[PDB]
């Protein structure tokens, strides 16, 4: 199938070349080789930001229709950030079928895109009210909670 073939090729390429500090791997299937439809990944905070030192864990759930449809990406546990729903689900343009998602988009592009989002929240689409408000009204407290969240997530 296209879905499995694509995911295999993404895995092949990722394991050979990926951004330092990131990780990504399919889960073990029940039998258990690889479950290519469900990956566990880690995104590191950028240096010289309050996210630094944290390794933030996400799951990526691929639908049967991928790459025509995007994967669902969920921080586990849910993350304090203006664009992360209380479920942990990330809100990002490239992960939206009706907006930025294209079959050409790669796992690497998705994870770098989420990494970029961490310290540069999109203020025009709040997914979480606590972090949003605090970001826009109390920037000092915001950054303070971000730094603590980073320590909670030291690798």
């Amino acid at each position: 199938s296209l879905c499995k073939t694509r995911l295999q090729e993404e895995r092949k390429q990722w394991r050979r070349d990926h951004p330092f500090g990131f990780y990504a791997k399919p889960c073990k299937s029940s039998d258990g080789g690889l479950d290519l439809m469900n990956w566990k990944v880690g995104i590191p905070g950028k240096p010289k930001t309050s996210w630094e030192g944290g390794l933030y864990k996400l799951t990526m759930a691929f639908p049967e229709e991928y790459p025509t449809r995007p994967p669902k990406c969920r921080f586990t546990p849910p993350l304090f950030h203006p664009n992360v729903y209380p479920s942990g689900t990330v809100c990002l343009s490239i992960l939206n079928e009706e907006e930025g998602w294209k079959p050409a988009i790669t796992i690497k592009q998705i994870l770098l895109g989420i990494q970029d989002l961490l310290d540069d929240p999109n203020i025009a689409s709040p997914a979480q009210t606590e972090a949003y408000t605090m970001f826009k009204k109390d920037k000092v407290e915001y950054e303070k909670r971000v730094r603590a969240q980073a320590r909670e997530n030291a690798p």
């Binding site: 394991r15 050979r16 070349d17 330092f20 990780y23 690798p155």
Partner: protein, 74 residues
């Protein structure tokens, strides 16, 4: 065949590809990385692969590493 090729990628050093014997330990692999990039070896240097720290006492052939795999040097 004795050798496996690995990409050792780091925050502050250029990429280093090494072809190392699979019966080297993870610690040996770090030691060779260090002499190869001219940094001093210490015991708190670790290698990360698929979100897990490799055990310095494991032989490379005992790990899940495969030819051309990237290992992150921390």
């Amino acid at each position: 065949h004795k050798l496996i090729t690995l990409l050792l990628r780091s925050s502050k050093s250029e990429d280093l590809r090494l072809s190392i014997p699979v019966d080297f330990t993870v610690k040996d692999l770090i030691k060779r990385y260090c002499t190869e990039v001219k940094i001093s070896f210490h015991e708190r240097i670790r290698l990360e692969f698929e979100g897990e720290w490799l055990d310095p006492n494991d032989q490379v052939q005992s790990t899940e590493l495969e030819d051309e795999d990237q290992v992150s040097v921390v």
